[PDB]
Amino acid sequence: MELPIAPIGRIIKDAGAERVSDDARITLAKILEEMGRDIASEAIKLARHAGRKTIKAEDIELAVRRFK
Amino acid sequence: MELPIAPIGRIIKDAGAERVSDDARITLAKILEEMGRDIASEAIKLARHAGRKTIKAEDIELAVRRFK
């Protein structure tokens, strides 16, 4: 797993939860990482289509729109 | 921002990108954090509906299904 867990617990607390179990932190970290990989994989193909090896903010933005 | 940037660059690299700019890292970190907050905010309401103050893995799982 690339994402660390404590920042994910802080996101849930910032939305208002009073208490958070470890299992909820780990599960939301796993789902964000999965979404992250699917968006990155589409952004890579977009950058390739524009003649680039470098992924830029516009490739990510266009890939998130292409999930609908 | 709660999410740190370096782990987000590692997700994009693990999907195969050869190079990643800082702007792409920052933008994907911002979009995951936004998705995280929307899922956490729905999970809080679900936990409340089940008589709990503690957010559990099942509330997160049901909230991700409820975005469709």
Curated annotation (Swiss-Prot), chains A, B:
Sequence segments annotated as region (Interaction with DNA): 19-21, 53-56
GO terms assigned for molecular function: double-stranded DNA binding; protein heterodimerization activity; protein homodimerization activity
Keywords (A to Z) from UniProt: Chromosome, Cytoplasm, DNA-binding
GO biological process terms, semicolon-separated: DNA topological change; protein homooligomerization
Consequence recorded when altering R10S: Loss of formation of nucleosome-like structures with DNA
InterPro entries with a match to the protein in the record: Archaeal_histone_HMF (IPR050947), CBFA_NFYB_domain (IPR003958), Histone-fold (IPR009072), HmfB-like (IPR050004)
Induction: Expression is relatively low during exponential growth, and is higher during the stationary phase.
GO cellular component: chromosome; cytoplasm
Localisation per UniProt entry: Cytoplasm; Chromosome
Residues of the site described as Interaction with DNA: K13
Family, per entry: Belongs to the archaeal histone HMF family.
Oligomeric and partner information: Homodimer and heterodimer of HmfA and HmfB. Heterodimers may be formed primarily when cells enter stationary growth. Dimers then assemble into higher oligomers, with the DNA wrapped around the protein core. Higher order oligomerization of these structures can give rise to long, superhelical fibers (in vitro).
Function: Binds and compacts DNA (95 to 150 base pairs) to form nucleosome-like structures that contain positive DNA supercoils. Increases the resistance of DNA to thermal denaturation in vitro.
The protein's name in its UniProt record: DNA-binding protein HMf-2
Originating species: Methanothermus fervidus
Phylogenetic classification of the source organism: Archaea, Methanobacteriati, Methanobacteriota, Methanomada group, Methanobacteria
